[PDB]
């Protein structure tokens, strides 16, 4: 018939787990670290001991507890010698701090281990095991997104220093056979692969897949109250203008200060002329009591229909000397706010649900290690909602052409290799198309593939960017 949509058609990308083969079994010697922690002693200890002694690896038992700084563990690691393997078992069969889900002991502990190893002048890959952190298909169910945050931060660390990371395997919870049948085929596999997910038959790896744009005719009802967090906040104001040009008598453009932050005259004039009196905000979002107040502020008729969590709590993502508590306090608003909205809208009927994440979480660019845990948590929450039957979306977005706060020297660095920019006008129709075809976690970013390859490959071999022929340049 016609397309005329080549830009958005080439703008779409996915993440999928193609089946993978095996590497090379090894019969080698070396002091293998196990990081047994304090309460992690389980059948995994016996399995690892037996397997490593069969492979000849010297299982180096170690006991670790809550954050111990980043020096003493390095000092005790200097007293054993060269460690040829580390099996991070810290995240298995562990609950989560529901009060502060972003603040987990596992991420801080493993970051301290990474820093100590860096100070330990060893340079051994740190292999980590997860339990249902990722799904190779919607038929599976994910029970935690903090493990996804660990995945993202580990990928960021891998992109930071090649010699320290390597190994992010996934094992189903309460399983023995998946580890038993592969073992050295993955932990000592010669073939370069890191996003391993052991499951039943074989293994899988995260891979980039360009999506398609089948024709559709549905469209979400433009009217109805819509919650848009972050207030004006640049991108948020542009989305508000887009909604006004679509037509909505009432919405909710929540900011931390709402009208007291900016207020503006042009924004309210547009919202009134194109639409009608649209409530802005009365309080913040990071507090559950604030969510209760916002719920109490809801009137009658034209009820809530969509939620666009465009949080503006992003400050920085540079690793340097990170701490888990620092990441938690830097990303309080988006995680706690998203959790509050999820729990407060369990029974309420909604038309759309957009977490509105960002890019640099699929690959984890350097200097953006703080946004990745939040993006992973949003993606996990969206997956939980979709598997539970409730609508959700986990769009990941790049840098806007008119983004005043989200475009600077780092945007110039991305411009000099890879993405140049993207006009926000096309973002509206891209979002409409994504919402049309029941999408969950779509990727909308344009990439100059040759520059991206020459800036990304460098010294780390990776098969993640291999399944797309347009990236052969």
């Amino acid at each position: 018939r016609s397309t005329e949509v080549d830009e958005v058609s080439a703008l779409r990308y996915r993440i999928e787990w193609r089946p993978t083969g095996a590497g090379e079994p090894a019969r080698l010697d070396g002091t293998w670290l196990v990081a047994k922690y304090a309460g992690t002693a389980d059948e995994t200890s016996t399995a690892a001991r037996e397997a490593l002694e069969s492979a000849g690896a010297r299982v180096r038992e170690l006991v670790v507890d809550a954050r111990c700084g980043r020096d003493e563990l390095a000092e005790r690691l200097r007293s054993v010698g060269e460690v040829a393997g580390v099996l991070s078992l810290l995240a298995v069969d562990e609950a989560e701090p529901e009060e502060a889900p972003l603040a987990l002991a596992s991420l801080a502990d493993t970051l301290s281990l990474v820093q100590a190893m860096v100070s330990a002048e060893l340079g051994c890959p740190l292999w980590t095991v997860t339990e249902s952190a990722v799904a190779t298909g919607p038929f599976e169910r994910v029970r935690n997104a903090a493990h996804g945050a660990l995945w993202g931060v580990g990928r960021v660390i891998a992109l930071e220093n090649p010699a320290v990371w390597g190994g992010l395997v996934d094992v189903p919870a309460g399983s023995v056979a998946e580890l038993a049948r592969h073992l050295a085929a993955v932990v000592s596999g010669g073939a370069g692969e890191d996003q391993l997910a052991l499951r039943a038959d074989g293994v899988y790896g995260r891979r980039w897949v360009r999506a398609a744009a089948p024709a559709t005719d549905d469209e979400w009802k433009p009217t109805g109250t819509v919650l848009v967090t972050g207030g004006t906040g640049g991108v948020g104001g542009q989305i508000a203008r887009w909604l006004a040009r679509r037509g909505a008598p009432h919405l909710l453009l929540v900011s931390r200060s709402g009208p007291d932050a900016d207020g503006a005259g042009e924004l309210v004039a547009e919202l009134e002329a194109l639409g009608a009196r649209t409530t802005v905000a009365a309080c913040d979002v990071t507090d559950r009591e604030s969510v209760r107040e916002l719920l109490g502020g809801i009137g009658d008729d034209v009820p809530l229909s969509a939620v666009f969590h465009a949080a503006a709590t992003l400050d920085d993502g540079t690793v340097d000397t990170l701490t888990g508590e620092r990441i938690e306090r830097a990303s309080r608003a988006k995680v706690l706010g998203a959790r509050n909205l999820h729990e407060l809208t369990r029974e309420l009927d909604l038309t759309a649900f957009v977490l509105f994440s960002s890019f640099a979480s699929a690959f984890g660019a350097p200097g953006l290690g703080g946004y990745a845990p939040g993006n992973a948590y949003l993606d996990g929450l969206a997956q939980q909602r979709r598997s539970d039957g409730l609508p959700a979306t986990a769009v990941a977005w790049g840098t806007w052409a008119g983004s005043g706060m989200a475009e600077g020297p780092v945007a110039d660095r991305f411009r000099r290799h890879g993405v140049i920019e993207m006009p926000p006008e096309t973002a509206c129709r891209a979002l409409q198309n994504a919402l049309d075809r029941a999408e969950v976690c779509p990727i909308v970013i344009d990439v100059r593939w040759d520059r991206f390859l020459l800036a990304y490959t460098a010294q780390r071999p990776t098969r993640l960017f291999d399944e797309i022929d347009d990236a052969r340049r």
Binding site: R14, E16, W17, R18, P19, T136, G137, P138, F139, E140, A200, D201, Y204, G389, L390, P391, R437, A438, E439, V440
Partner: protein
């Protein structure tokens, strides 16, 4: 081989894992909260 089939019968297991991924199926829009939506399946597994 038939011998492997007999072994499986003897140990008494099942071969239900999930939908494949090599055939290039969409695998995403195959399900929805509404079961009456066109192009939606119901089975989340099976032996393939």
């Amino acid at each position: 081989t038939p011998e492997e089939f007999w072994e499986l019968l003897s140990e008494g297991r099942d071969a239900v894992a999930g939908l494949p991924t090599d055939r290039g199926w969409d695998l995403d829009s195959l399900f929805h909260p509404d079961p009456t939506r066109s192009g939606t399946a119901h089975q989340r597994g099976g032996g393939f």
